[PDB]
Amino acid sequence: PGSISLGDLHGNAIKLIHFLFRHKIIKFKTEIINFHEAYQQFVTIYEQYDDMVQEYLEIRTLLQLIQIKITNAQQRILDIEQKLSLATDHQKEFSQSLLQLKKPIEANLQMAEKSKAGLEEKLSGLKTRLPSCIERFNKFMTQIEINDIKTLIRLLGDEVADRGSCDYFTLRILDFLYQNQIAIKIILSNHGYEFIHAYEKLVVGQPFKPKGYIGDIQIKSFWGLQLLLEQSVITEEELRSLVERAYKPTLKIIDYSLSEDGITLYSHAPIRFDSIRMAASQLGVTYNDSTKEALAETIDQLNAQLQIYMKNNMLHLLFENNEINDPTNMTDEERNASPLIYLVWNRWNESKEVENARPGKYNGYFVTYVHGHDPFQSPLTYVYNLDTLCGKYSRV
Amino acid sequence: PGSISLGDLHGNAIKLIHFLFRHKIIKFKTEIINFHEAYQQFVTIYEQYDDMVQEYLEIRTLLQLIQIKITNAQQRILDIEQKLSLATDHQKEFSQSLLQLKKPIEANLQMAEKSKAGLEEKLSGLKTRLPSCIERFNKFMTQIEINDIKTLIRLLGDEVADRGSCDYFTLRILDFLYQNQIAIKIILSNHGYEFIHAYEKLVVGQPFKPKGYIGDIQIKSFWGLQLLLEQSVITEEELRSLVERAYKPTLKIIDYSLSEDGITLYSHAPIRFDSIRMAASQLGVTYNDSTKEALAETIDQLNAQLQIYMKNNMLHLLFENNEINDPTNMTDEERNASPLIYLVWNRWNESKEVENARPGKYNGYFVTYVHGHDPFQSPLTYVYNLDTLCGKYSRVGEEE
Ligand SMILES: [Br-]
Ligand SMILES: [Br-]
Ligand SMILES: [Br-]
Ligand SMILES: [Br-]
Ligand SMILES: [Br-]
Ligand SMILES: [Br-]
Ligand SMILES: [Mn+2]
Ligand SMILES: [Mn+2]
Ligand SMILES: [Mn+2]
Ligand SMILES: [Mn+2]
């Protein structure tokens, strides 16, 4: 009834596969003879898909730029055409000048349209290659079976919408775990938020587009999924199924585990202990931590509120603050105003390693902190900064 | 005919006034003494107004930021209220949480409104101070008279919409010269364009707002004029009267004078000789430089075409190119595509100082180049980069 936590994913489905193999959660079926050959198949699929998404991102950028060029040229042509139409009978040099001024704009517009068509054809070429990639991924997934079912898997965040190749692979792996009754919890993260932002727009009839605070290269794995949806390689029905059953139910603002005499607090970013009380304040949850069980119950109630916001497609209401200058170093006022932003964006440093930030004993119970990768290394023996593919076990 | 040229004005009416005194174009009337005390009164007005426009720029920026806060908060509130429907379907617990979310946004909206109102109050206080300043300027303009009417005045550009206090002062001084039959030519410039862009919009009933490529601090003197217009201290009718009679007719793409054996080319930016044919190509002007007279006639035709664009409120058609990355360092392609932008934005540097860029003799005639101040110093004796320290008169033998 223990758990293993993974703090280093960055939207990279190979890293999830690596973690699941190395901790004996999954294994190849008996029929597979060559482990390294079978595993290298996914590495190759993943790399080829990564290259296709890179190609897509460059096409996306060029298409956006060319559409600005086309719209500008069209507006300028229309303006000159109105001036010519409104001309007086004594404006022959005026009309002659404007007629010849319009020609280079028309030529630029034709060149931009031709360029746009070529980029659309390149995108069409990508679409013809995408099914082959997915079919090879599907064949790989049929070679896998569950091994250990008794261990809770915890992902500390940035599992989607990050620097890897494709959130579809990751969602499919989460759904494989769901179909095999594996207990899994995922901490809400700053990259996870970009994904959820896009998904809850999609299901209300807005574009499946991220918030866009994080740049496209740093949410590449979202674009790897969106490419499949926009090119009709996967159905919106399947995306909704994966997200609704295998992803959203796992999400926690904060997770915990209880020992005989202590609590362990799992967060995405490194966080002060008192940020939990601030999160309770924003969400209308009564905060109590007099005992480890009371703090556990407080956190349960925070996570129930998260599920209410997500079920209503309104998580974005808790993640909007246009006055924060640096979400990795939020001021006292900013932390109080937007505690969930702090919980997913904070980065530790020496000035934050102070007395009372993260006590190791509190109200007579021990407190252990486990969070996702962060550059700063705290010397506190009860702070675990998971910047490795190796999992952290919870003990007896 | 002789001329004087000013290459460093930067929207500063004091610099213009000093230039006109220094070269004996104007003088105080004999009833004024002491002369120093009268000039110093205009200096005080100008500096007083300069500080006022600085205050105005600070208010403008703060108001623009506050309007962003206000609009953001209003959208979020309206968003939440729309989600607060309906009460019935036991979203009650959830209604409560959304109501609590709304409270800090409403508090931030109210705070931003109070700040906006106090800034609009500050602007109102500024407004009450403006009339006296214009009154003192008007008194000063009654104290001067024309002196030399036989010298052509050439402004090499950035005469308006630049770093000084107020384009109204400058336009009134231009009108004074116009009223006294002074010949004036002004070279079209990058700050000049910001002014004209706004003025052309005003003429056709659009807001008196600049293109906005140049930052507000660097077009301060436009804002000092716009402050008078928007606060109803001067009329739209007066402003247009001044611009139509005393400013727009003087404008040139490039100007020239002819000597017995050469041509002198006056520009705002330092420019390559081959920029002239590029300007001709965009304007549909037949280009001919086989003789200095043919080149002079080409430039005359460029300037006639400029006046068509000016008269029809459409100069913006020649100054729009969203593809240029650095207007001060345009590529060959960019120069061919937008030659007038090149003519007003180019900044020279060592890489541009090459043998055929600006030849001193061409097709049998000498070529001399005169342009507004530019930091790079070319060691060509026939290139005149008119920092304020350089002599302003035309060289011997040039006939303007
Ligand atoms: Br006309
Ligand atoms: Br889509
Ligand atoms: Br902190
Ligand atoms: Br001077
Ligand atoms: Br106005
Ligand atoms: Br050049
Ligand atoms: Mn993160
Ligand atoms: Mn480590
Ligand atoms: Mn200068
Ligand atoms: Mn300039």
Header resolution in angstroms: 1.8
d(CA B373, CA B360): 20
Q: Does B71 touch chain A (CB under 8 A)?
A: no
Q: What is the CA radius of gyration of chain A?
A: 26
Alpha-carbon distance B355 to nearest alpha carbon in chain A (angstroms): 31
- Out of B93, B101, B314, the one facing A317 most closely (by C-beta) is B101
How is A268-335 classified by DSSP, letter by letter?
SS---TTHHHHHHHHHTPPP--SSHHHHHHHHHHHHHHHHHHHHTT-GGGGS--TT-S-GGG--HHHH
Helix, strand, coil percentages (3-state) for chain B, rounded to 5, are: 55, 10, 35
Asked if residue A254 lies in contact with residue A279, where contact means CB atoms within 8 angstroms, the answer is yes
C-alpha distances (whole Å) from B266 to each of A74, B18, B185, B255, B256 are 36, 22, 10, 5, 6
Q: Does B76 touch chain A (CB under 8 A)?
A: yes
- Using an 8 Å CB-CB cutoff, list chain A residues near B101: 282, 317-318
- Out of B72, B96, B323, the one facing A284 most closely (by C-beta) is B96
Whole-number Å distance, alpha carbon A8 to ligand 7 midpoint, is 10
A93/B308 touch (CB, cutoff 8 Å), yes or no: yes
DSSP state of A244: I
**How were these coordinates obtained?**
X-ray
Q: Does A82 touch chain B (CB under 8 A)?
A: no
DSSP state of B328: G
- Which DSSP helix (H) or strand (E) runs through A372? strand A365-372
Q: Does B305 touch chain A (CB under 8 A)?
A: yes
Residue A8, annotated as binding a ligand:
yes
Residue A10, annotated as binding a ligand:
yes
- Angle of CA points A219, A165, A239, to nearest 5°: 80
- Out of A97, A320, A322, the one facing B305 most closely (by C-beta) is A97
- Out of A76, A93, A284, the one facing B100 most closely (by C-beta) is A284
The overall longest dimension of chain B from CA atoms, in Å, is 95
Chains A, B: CB contacts within 8 A come to 49
A96/B308 touch (CB, cutoff 8 Å), yes or no: no
Q: Does B94 touch chain A (CB under 8 A)?
A: yes
Q: Does A102 touch chain B (CB under 8 A)?
A: no
Q: Does A87 touch chain B (CB under 8 A)?
A: no
Q: Omega into A313 within 30° of 0, i.e. cis?
A: no
What are the strands, taking DSSP E only, across chain B? 3-6, 26-28, 144-146, 152-155, 184-187, 251-252, 255-258, 262-267, 361-362, 365-372, 383-386
d(CA A285, CA A263): 20
Number of H helices, E strands in chain B: 11, 11
Q: Which stretches within B143-270 are classed as H helix? A: 167-179, 190-203, 220-230, 236-246
d(CA B153, CA A221): 65
Which token pair is A325?
A: 């200058």
Q: Please report, as a single letter, which amino acid is at residue A84.
A: L
Asked if residue B263 lies in contact with residue B290, where contact means CB atoms within 8 angstroms, the answer is no
β-pairing verdict for A3-6 and B262-267: unpaired
| Cβ-proximal residues to B80 (8 Å cutoff; 6+ apart), any chain | A317, B98, B101, B102, B105
Which token pair is B13?
A: 């009416």
Alpha-carbon distance A284 to nearest alpha carbon in chain B (angstroms): 6
Whole-number Å distance, alpha carbon B388 to ligand 4 midpoint, is 6
- Using an 8 Å CB-CB cutoff, list chain A residues near B82: none
Three-class SS state of A153: strand
d(CA B68, CA A78): 32
Whole-number Å distance, alpha carbon A29 to ligand 8 midpoint, is 32
